[model samples]
Target: TKQTGLMLDIARHFYSPEVIKSFIDTISLSGGNFLHLHFSDHENYAIESHLLNQRAENAVQGKDGIYINPYTGKPFLSYRQLDDIKAYAKAKGIELIPELDSPNHMTAIFKLVQKDRGVKYLQGLKSRQVDDEIDITNADSITFMQSLMSEVIDIFGDTSQHFHIGGDEFGYSVESNHEFITYANKLSYFLEKKGLKTRMWNDGLIKNTFEQINPNIEITYWSYDGDTQDKNEAAERRDMRVSLPELLAKGFTVLNYNSYYLYIVPKASPTFSQDAAFAAKDVIKNWDLGVWDGRNTKNRVQNTHEIAGAALSIWGEDAKALKDETIQKNTKSLLEAVIHKTNG
Candidate 1:
């Protein structure tokens, strides 16, 4: 393939419009084909909603009041601006895939969905941490999720897909939450039956149940654990992982977008908060931390083609410490390897 794909995490580290637009232009010029737009993440910022409610109002309260991005003196990218960027990328032949993570990443949703009591809210939230059932398990929760999805989808259509129903970075015990287990069954069923397609990780789906999955739904594997080998080898991976086996046993065409050479580099600029002393400087690099061999370009990209497009990923609470400029140099070095593959 002669195209590069991108997964820009703007929600984590808010960049200046010029910085972001420049990055977009850079990717486009590099013959990139796909851009996975991460609109929101855990580190900071929440978009606006009419029904905004504060479930717990659990605030970590930095020196900067409640909703200020003190780092760059700029807030998160607005929906309209994101749309403009989407339009710009589309003009350059890039399909920007917007993934709105949910259910578990509900600190934003919890901003609206209220709990009657604080003590009860604490118990409910704790239960969710260890139990997938507390989330998207009840009618109110499901309605909340459905409404959020509807709002986002309307804001970004054709430019978005894959609701990214967050099933990762959560706990999984046998005694699942009553609401979650029930929701998983109905949610998948709802997506399949609604004539609308959605994508999710094996987080909730595989762990929640194994009896039967919505054949129409698609799955994406995202755990950083050791289970990948076992799942892939056994072919019990789930929606996307089920592969042709489902069709062979039954009758359906299966397409999978699991692990491969598709590099996944987690941007590290989030560490540069206003309190970080060097947040501004760090943002310049937009680093992704991980071990790198820094191999030769021609050989590296060529080798990736031989493999399945090896990915790069950087995450963790410590990811905030990623040094700026270094990240850019690192990524640029890799891109150069790709651009100059034919030369050397």
Candidate 2:
């Protein structure tokens, strides 16, 4: 099995470490070896952190999460609980990868930045309403991210070899590629310097910066082309499509997170149907490690590329609004389908 894994949105809905360990058991039983946790987002910061200062305590849906006054604790995961899971996964022959999505999908963290540092706004923001994005151009913003990731490295650096500095769906327009390129270069360099392999989502990126953006960073190519969520979304999916040939030409290691087949939006029926159908029926049969299809089937990858294998990424978009078991039932089948395909 080649890097067969599941990326769970543990931030939006609180799931106990005991429950996550069960999921880990399921993956291990199926010959899977990776458990990637998307542990931070706009809704909440599920993982316990000293640096974040107990923000978004009530963020998780359906239940009261880390409290503000009584005692601040993100009940789902903590530094202590995380170490236990690491040991469990190690015994089960699985690697636990940590993801802290940045520059966007971090409104919870933004509030902390405002309260702690007295900073009201960032340099490269494109929205008056959406405050989820971080300013890459602002020196302070970069330093803040670096500081947080430094803490992240201190925690997961020993056991987890790869860290995901999320660069996905950063819903806005930066003035030019110069800013993002500089921002990405800095972050990637910083993580790499810390003796950890860096992974980034292949979205919200333009075509021209390939040579400039660090090739050492492994890219998880999630989408090729797609629609915009209103006009505020900076680049149309078309602009962000990672040119397969170009990446292969540049020798960047790639992983297939192609939304056309592997994404499971639990409560979103229409999207779920399409993805579930493909994941179950087409994954082992029609899809291969080289397929990079999102909305554009034409953007295909080939055998020679450094394919790190595929993953089943389930986003927790208001997932706690649905019954907890409902999400469990919906994702397991689809998730297992991918595992069997890749593992078999």
**Which of the numbered candidates is closest to the native, going by highest lDDT?**
2
Scanning candidate 2 in windows of ten residues, the lowest lDDT window is 64-73
Best by TM-score: 2
lDDT of 2 by residue, 1-344 (tens): 37888888887766666667877887888778888888888776666566765433433423432233123223346566688888888889888788888778887666555544546443233234345577677777788788899987887656677889888767444444556678888988898888888888876456766677888888888865433455544255455555655677778877778777787666645465455555567666676666676545465655533666778887778565665445655567667778876655
lDDT of 1: 0.42
Query: How much is 86 displaced in model 2, in angstroms?
Result: 1.7
Per model, how many backbone clashes are there?
18, 0
The pairs that clash in candidate 2 are: none
Per-candidate TM equals 0.57, 0.82
Off by over 4 Å in 1: 1-4, 26-31, 45-48, 51-74, 111-134, 177-196, 205-211, 224-329, 332-344
Candidate 2: Cα lDDT at 65 = 29
